[PDB]
Amino acid sequence: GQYKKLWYLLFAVLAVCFTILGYMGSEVYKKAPPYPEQVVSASGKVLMAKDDILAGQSAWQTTGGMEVGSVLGHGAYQAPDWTADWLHRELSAWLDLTAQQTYGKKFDEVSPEEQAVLKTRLADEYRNQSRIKEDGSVVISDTRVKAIESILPYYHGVYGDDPALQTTREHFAMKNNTLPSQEAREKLFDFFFWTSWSASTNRPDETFTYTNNWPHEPLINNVPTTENYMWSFTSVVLLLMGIGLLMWGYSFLTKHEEVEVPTEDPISKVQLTPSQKALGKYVFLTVALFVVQVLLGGLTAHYTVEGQGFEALGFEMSDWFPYALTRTWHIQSAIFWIATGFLTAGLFLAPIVNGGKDPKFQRAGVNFLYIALFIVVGGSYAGNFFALTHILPPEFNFWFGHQGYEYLDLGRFWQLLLMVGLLLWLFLMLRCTVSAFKEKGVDKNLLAIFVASMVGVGVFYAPGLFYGEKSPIAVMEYWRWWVVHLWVEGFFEVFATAAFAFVFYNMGFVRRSTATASTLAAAAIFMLGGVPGTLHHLYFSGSTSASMAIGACFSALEVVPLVLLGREAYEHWSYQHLSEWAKRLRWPLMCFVAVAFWNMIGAGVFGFLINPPISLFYIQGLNTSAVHAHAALFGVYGFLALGFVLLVARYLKPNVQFDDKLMTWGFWLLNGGLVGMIAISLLPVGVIQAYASITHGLWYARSEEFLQMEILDTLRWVRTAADLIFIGGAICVAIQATKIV
Amino acid sequence: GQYKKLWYLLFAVLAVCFTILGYMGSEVYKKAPPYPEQVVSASGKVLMAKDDILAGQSAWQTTGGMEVGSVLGHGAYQAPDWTADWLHRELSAWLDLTAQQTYGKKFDEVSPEEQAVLKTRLADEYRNQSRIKEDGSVVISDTRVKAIESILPYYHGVYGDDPALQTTREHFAMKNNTLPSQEAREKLFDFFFWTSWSASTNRPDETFTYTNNWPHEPLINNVPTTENYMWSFTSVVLLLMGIGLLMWGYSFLTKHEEVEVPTEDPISKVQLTPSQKALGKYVFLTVALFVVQVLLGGLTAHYTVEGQGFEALGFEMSDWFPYALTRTWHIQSAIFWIATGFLTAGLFLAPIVNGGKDPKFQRAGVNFLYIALFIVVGGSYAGNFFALTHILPPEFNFWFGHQGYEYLDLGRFWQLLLMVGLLLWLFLMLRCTVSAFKEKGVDKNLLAIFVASMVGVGVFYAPGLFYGEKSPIAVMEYWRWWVVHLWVEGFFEVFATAAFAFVFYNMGFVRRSTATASTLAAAAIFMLGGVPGTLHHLYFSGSTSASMAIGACFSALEVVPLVLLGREAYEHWSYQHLSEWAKRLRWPLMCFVAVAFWNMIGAGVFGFLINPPISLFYIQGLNTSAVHAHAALFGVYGFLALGFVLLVARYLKPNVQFDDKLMTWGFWLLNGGLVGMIAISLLPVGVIQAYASITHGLWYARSEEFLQMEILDTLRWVRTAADLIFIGGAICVAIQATKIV
Ligand code: HEM
Ligand code: HEM
Ligand code: HEM
Numbered sequence A, B: 001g002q003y004k005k006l007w008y009l010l011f012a013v014l015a016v017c018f019t020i021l022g023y024m025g026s027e028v029y030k031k032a033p034p035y036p037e038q039v040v041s042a043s044g045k046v047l048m049a050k051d052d053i054l055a056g057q058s059a060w061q062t063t064g065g066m067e068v069g070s071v072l073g074h075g076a077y078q079a080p081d082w083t084a085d086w087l088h089r090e091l092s093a094w095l096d097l098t099a100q101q102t103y104g105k106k107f108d109e110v111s112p113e114e115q116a117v118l119k120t121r122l123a124d125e126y127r128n129q130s131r132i133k134e135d136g137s138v139v140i141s142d143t144r145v146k147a148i149e150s151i152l153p154y155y156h157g158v159y160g161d162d163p164a165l166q167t168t169r170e171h172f173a174m175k176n177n178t179l180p181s182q183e184a185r186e187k188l189f190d191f192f193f194w195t196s197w198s199a200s201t202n203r204p205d206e207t208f209t210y211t212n213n214w215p216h217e218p219l220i221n222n223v224p225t226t227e228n229y230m231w232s233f234t235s236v237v238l239l240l241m242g243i244g245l246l247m248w249g250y251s252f253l254t255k256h257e258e259v260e261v262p263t264e265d266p267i268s269k270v271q272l273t274p275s276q277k278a279l280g281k282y283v284f285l286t287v288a289l290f291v292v293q294v295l296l297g298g299l300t301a302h303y304t305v306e307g308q309g310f311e312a313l314g315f316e317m318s319d320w321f322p323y324a325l326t327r328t329w330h331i332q333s334a335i336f337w338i339a340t341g342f343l344t345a346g347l348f349l350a351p352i353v354n355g356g357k358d359p360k361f362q363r364a365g366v367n368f369l370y371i372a373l374f375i376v377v378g379g380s381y382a383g384n385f386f387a388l389t390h391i392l393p394p395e396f397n398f399w400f401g402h403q404g405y406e407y408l409d410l411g412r413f414w415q416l417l418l419m420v421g422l423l424l425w426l427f428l429m430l431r432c433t434v435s436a437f438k439e440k441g442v443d444k445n446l447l448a449i450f451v452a453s454m455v456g457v458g459v460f461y462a463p464g465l466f467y468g469e470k471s472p473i474a475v476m477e478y479w480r481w482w483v484v485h486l487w488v489e490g491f492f493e494v495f496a497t498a499a500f501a502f503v504f505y506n507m508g509f510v511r512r513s514t515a516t517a518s519t520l521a522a523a524a525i526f527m528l529g530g531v532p533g534t535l536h537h538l539y540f541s542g543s544t545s546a547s548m549a550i551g552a553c554f555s556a557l558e559v560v561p562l563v564l565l566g567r568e569a570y571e572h573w574s575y576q577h578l579s580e581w582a583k584r585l586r587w588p589l590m591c592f593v594a595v596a597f598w599n600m601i602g603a604g605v606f607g608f609l610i611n612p613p614i615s616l617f618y619i620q621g622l623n624t625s626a627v628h629a630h631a632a633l634f635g636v637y638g639f640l641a642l643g644f645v646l647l648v649a650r651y652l653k654p655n656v657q658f659d660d661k662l663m664t665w666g667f668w669l670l671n672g673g674l675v676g677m678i679a680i681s682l683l684p685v686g687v688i689q690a691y692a693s694i695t696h697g698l699w700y701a702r703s704e705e706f707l708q709m710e711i712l713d714t715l716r717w718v719r720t721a722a723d724l725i726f727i728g729g730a731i732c733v734a735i736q737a738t739k740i741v
């Protein structure tokens, strides 16, 4: 139509960004750290062939995966980082062995000059002993073989049953036999060794490791590279130059037009079809998983202060429901109820778009989608419970058990079933619009972008597939962030914006041109830095030095739209003071004003704190990622889902009022709990934990005696005072939404 | 009045910030690096007592001061940094002497292990050999005495006459006998030694030097401290949290009111008093110094590519007008014409405020101020010329010669004379308002803030005094930035804002309440981060570690108002499309739209690039400070001064039109030259020079062979293509402003 410039600008953004992203994925396949054919000692004692590295990667997913610790930065934050911990134990062992056969003392009775000699001899057998080319063989001296063999007792004790290594499994919140089979418990440490090898060995040509000198290890001069500084001083310039240049466009290209609303609620005139009346059970589920998901959060936060249970009447608590299991359930349920809220908010708009009716048997397909959703959520949680007690045979662990990679913890069978359910939902949504496209009216522009976003949110769960059980780590780390970063942080902020404009145009709150030109210009800024910014999750996990130059500069244009979001929060807050009928949809509009607030304090202020490559170097794997996780995820998409189901509750029982005094408590208790469990517990621990990782190293900030310090312990204990408030607010909102329906 | 909350908020900001600033100045006096009583060798050979350090600091100001090089970071950018250069030469000499008496090789035939031993022995005689307490004595080993004595030939040759050290004085753009007296040329190197001593010696209690580990020197582990990282990750959070939270206030607390203008130019009805007609010679001077100041800029940029002259018919060019002299004149003239523009813009408003008349002998005072200004500008430039040829006796050098500290280069006599002239100007301005205060009308609120800013800009040149010739360096470095940072970057952005609101309220463009509540709320944000942010100029010059925590976090609230400045650029640009009489004052309003643009790209984007303590660590003293200097200073205050004198030109000859086609060239040539000499010459050199200082050290990025690299030489040569454009634009604007009057 007349928006032909705004459509071309959007097609030109998608073409150039999906090539920067696709080309840098063609290099992850051919520049990732390789699995060496053999790791031979210097003498010739072959040790740890590659198929044992793969058997250890498979044995790692049966222990809980990234939910029990963290490997190469990604994982949980209670047990240490196994790469940065193995590396330091092996380095200190090598040093204490070489200091004995040279001077006769244990590296600490040794004077600083000889400490310098020993350290400059250490960081040359680790760094410049790369993978031999023309054959995947890695040659290791005979002191490094004795250093590895002397630290294996500790790890056998921490992952197995050992009366000596109690009080260290309780501090890591680990069940006793995390990996019972001692035959597989030794192949897992081959995988741990390989991960610490790729993190301390120079690339075949450069002077930095395969992980860009990650993590911080002063013993071998693991420090930020030079372009690590340059590309981090550059992204700040791009951010500050785009913030004030978009505020310059907003002030010259926006006239603040004025509209008069209709007299009576133009959506409350369309009577409910038989399919829209089926959506009553979809609303109760979006706030039932929400209360189940928040209880599991307070139940997994209990293991971080005690490590054991309360239930001295029955079984062992930490044997069937350990920290890994409750953490997996508490992370997975946060995706299900959010996605359910978006699904029901779409399925409500579908029949209204088709004039006023349902084309065929929508009520049958809607009920089928409901049943499939329950099958997925139930079978996934049953497979997670069996795959951690090791009742399930280990060969069926990747397909029906626990994948071991967070945000994709459900087995592959349930993953395929969920993808099929998503395709069915997309089919229904698209089926209820082909009559609105085929029409001799004018301006189907605002409807085309809407169905574009509908397709996007339903299709981009497929990249979670095409990575197998035995594929390299750096490859799944690249396809996992196509569904966690791209399908959520960049495709849900287009569906939500288009749904805002569509809904608020049908209710006569905005003009036809203002709602289709501002949405179509906000769908380009959300993909200019959203698509190639995927690579800010792959800095230090096996990607080249150009990945952290592309992801650092593009994800800075990803904060530019978010901090100027007080402009749309005033528009949504004023819509309620326009009529006496628009004052009924007040609490739905009040959640959309909170979405805009947390989209700039959670995803823009605390999201850019950890974005630059030099900040994330010392910070990856600490409690600031959890600040950002809770703030961004809930504050944005949780309030989005709650507002959507509260707006669907209304118009579905248009005879029940909203009980202001129950929602004034529910709203502010949620908003006061989220700020409570950030400003008094999460952020102080993250800042004390950041100071230690800059002076000493990541091995220290995550160690057992550092997390138990009588200050970090009375600080993750005070978090409970701010979590009961949050649970109360969730209870209030759930009670209200159930009373309505 | 009714703005009693906005006045109290402003008094509460001034009270708390001027105590943070005053308390951190009470510590500069008692924590600065001290002048040691004696510097005795180990044996007992006393060397370089403190009065010789002071005699060398005095002898340093007679060589040009900070205009010939840079000491401790502050200065010019053609000759090296003398602290970071002396330090590295002495360290490498010490190493090559100790490597001879230990192994017999010159530290480069020496294997890496012995290089580690030598380096860990070097960075313990330099760091942990602090000032002996209870008496100001510093004990130096006998190798460090032989290392100092072996590098003095090079410096005697560079500051004196030596046929061998030609082609190194031409590369530094230095006249031959920069310091002729060999008796004083040796006491200056005592001052150089002391500055490199304070930069490589731990504080009496801490593990960092007196200059917070500056400069970057890998030989002695001069690297950023840990709180250097923490307070730099914190200021970014404050910046991003204030940007989006003020945009949230602007959107909820501003209604976009509408006003109707009067029918005819309410200021063009007041007839000109005999004093306002004297301001015709003030306008010609503001654009005569502007063309003289821009020519000296292109004349001092000529020494950076050749080092000598063109004038083979007369004398020696680089003997009477060296690089130091033209640089001093080109920096000092930029303050005079800017201040002159502000002065005349004030003296024009003074009689209009007094109803319509002049109280007493006002025109006599105006002519007296003119004569005093010419005496100052002439005597200063005469004293600078004589004090560099060493014709003036050296005892009268601080009072009538060259102070040696940039932005305060004029002698102290002319400084006192300028302060007296400023007090007289303030007297006139305040005298023409006592009848407008004494009145039984209402709402003298918008007039009180105006005279407040008038007092501020005239009084705060006094802190440039109370520092003497022999006061410690860290003390003058603290009083110099009370007039360069506070009296300009924080007191001229209040006078200009108040003058905007006052003028545009008298012409009926804004409401009475909108102009006195937004100005009074913008006078508090410009002092919340403007007053304590002074300390971001004192990071690495002798201040404690708390100064770079206070200045880093407060100067981040100093960018918050500047990036959201596209909001006031649309208001000023629209005022011209309101009448056929308001369309005459178009080019004055067009400069105020450029002031707002450069106040966010020059002072907000490139100003925060070098603000954080970890950015400035590797960057202080490079060509990014010049990018920021030109962009900020001209782009903001130059366009302010030009717009003020173009608005005073009109209303002073209300019969001459503005010749659009001459101002369309003048405006865009200036705006295209400023972007030209930044994006093609200054910024590329600064970025290539930043990369070298992060890998090697500041001694390398500033060295002679690095600045002569056939790429940095064909890049400061291409700058001339973008400077002739700027000179052309200045010529156009000057021609127009002279044609008017
Ligand atoms: C009382 C309420 C809550 C409590 C006590 C809580 C507690 C926790 C705990 C203990 C963890 C794991 C920390 C670790 O691995 O050491 C976590 C992680 C997480 N929680 Fe919550 N949570 C709560 C509410 C929520 C809500 C409402 C959401 C909504 C999406 C949510 C989403 C997440 C996510 C995404 C993570 C993963 C963080 C990461 O992997 O870095 N949580 N939470
Ligand atoms: C808008 C909604 C957003 C959501 C829901 C979200 C969610 C998350 C979550 C849950 C994590 C934790 C991943 C993990 O534990 O492995 C994460 C990581 C991260 N986020 Fe986002 N995010 C959002 C926006 C942003 C934005 C705009 C930025 C801009 C810089 C950003 C920067 C980062 C970075 C650098 C990480 C990596 C942290 C780490 O790996 O420890 N996020 N995000
Ligand atoms: C064609 C126009 C100009 C040229 C070629 C020019 C050139 C230069 C040069 C060569 C320097 C010294 C660089 C060094 O020390 O190595 C300098 C510094 C400076 N110029 Fe300009 N300049 C021009 C215009 C201006 C204008 C219009 C202003 C208005 C205020 C200005 C203000 C300054 C200031 C404040 C400095 C000090 C920079 C510092 O100390 O870091 N210049 N300029």
Ligand code: HEM
Binding pocket: B074, B075, B488, B489, B536, B537, B555, B556, B558, B559, B603, B604, B607, B608, B610, B611, B616, B620, B621, B622, B625, B628, B629, B630, B632, B633, B636, B637
């Ligand atoms: C608004 C008008 C401003 C003007 C006219 C201005 C002017 C200047 C000038 C000429 C310099 C060079 C000083 C020297 O060579 O020693 C400088 C330094 C500096 N400016 Fe500003 N500035 C302004 C605003 C700002 C702001 C808002 C910031 C915010 C961070 C800032 C940050 C800095 C820093 C950190 C330095 C030190 C650079 C160095 O010492 O090399 N400036 N300023």
Ligand SMILES: [Ca+2]
Binding pocket: A074, A075, A076, A406, A625
């Ligand atoms: Ca995680």
Ligand SMILES: [Ca+2]
Binding pocket: B074, B075, B076, B406, B625
């Ligand atoms: Ca300077």
Ligand SMILES: [Fe+3]
Binding pocket: A485, A489, A533, A534, A536, A537
């Ligand atoms: Fe992301």
Ligand SMILES: [Fe+3]
Binding pocket: B485, B489, B533, B534, B536, B537
């Ligand atoms: Fe400043």
